Amino acid sequence: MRLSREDLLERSEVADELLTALLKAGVITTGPGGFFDEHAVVILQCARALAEYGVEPRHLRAFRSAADRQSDLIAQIAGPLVKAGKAGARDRADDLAREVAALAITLHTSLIKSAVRDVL
Amino acid sequence: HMRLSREDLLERSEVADELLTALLKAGVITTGPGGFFDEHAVVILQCARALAEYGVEPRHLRAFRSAADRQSDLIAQIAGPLVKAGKAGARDRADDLAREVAALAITLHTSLIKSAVRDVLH
Ligand SMILES: [Hg+2]
Ligand SMILES: [Hg+2]
């Protein structure tokens, strides 16, 4: 959940040089708390395997760019639903925002898979 | 693999024909090159229906399609040249490597977006 740089390296099992390069290119970043999440471990492990096929850290900038733009769109769509959460006795509940976010990601992913299958 | 007629897609997705119409006219969902739908269209249609139920109209999904098409090209630039590099032994098919590579890049991209989204709502 909340991983240090050392934890990230140890769990991803990549070279420190790879991590350093992916941070330098902005491909991976820490969250608002200043630590890494489980997604970072998966990004790092996928980035290592891709580097092995010829993809440099520098080439994954395009993926990060697009993911940030997609996150903005999702925010616009999901952000309004934070206030509609079934809070119960608590003051806040973002569970519907998370549901809309997860549906939009699954939709977007399936579009990619479809288009990639086509072009190949 | 799997080539669905329009009515096969409606039956498997349990989504209304009018919703499919709206998605096709917005350009969010398209048929493959032969005029069939694939298994991914089932998921897309069902996700679009649940999104519509949260007030997100098919036309507001257009941007996910355009983005998906740009990403698909970036993945093809990587994977495309590796088609010819797959082992072609008796127990192999040459498409495998380019598929594995596409699947890594898609997994990478999915994690990036999940990470960017967690942060945009933290
Ligand atoms: Hg991996
Ligand atoms: Hg879905």
Swiss-Prot record, chain B:
Top-level taxon = Bacteria
Q: Which residues cross the membrane?
A: none
Regulation: induction? Autoregulated.
Stated role: Transcriptional regulator that binds to its own promoter and thus may play a role in the regulation of the cotranscribed genes Rv1827 and Rv1828. Can also bind several promoter regions of genes that are essential, including ftsZ. Binds to the imperfect everted repeat sequence CTCAA through its winged-HTH motif.
**Extra facts:** Was identified as a high-confidence drug target.
Domains: entry comment: Contains an N-terminal DNA-binding domain, a linker region and a C-terminal effector binding domain. Dimerization is mediated via the C-terminal domain.
The subunit structure is: Homodimer.
Q: How is this protein named in the record?
A: Uncharacterized HTH-type transcriptional regulator Rv1828
Species per Swiss-Prot/TrEMBL record: Mycobacterium tuberculosis (strain ATCC 25618 / H37Rv)
Indicate the span of the full protein covered: 127 to 246 of 247
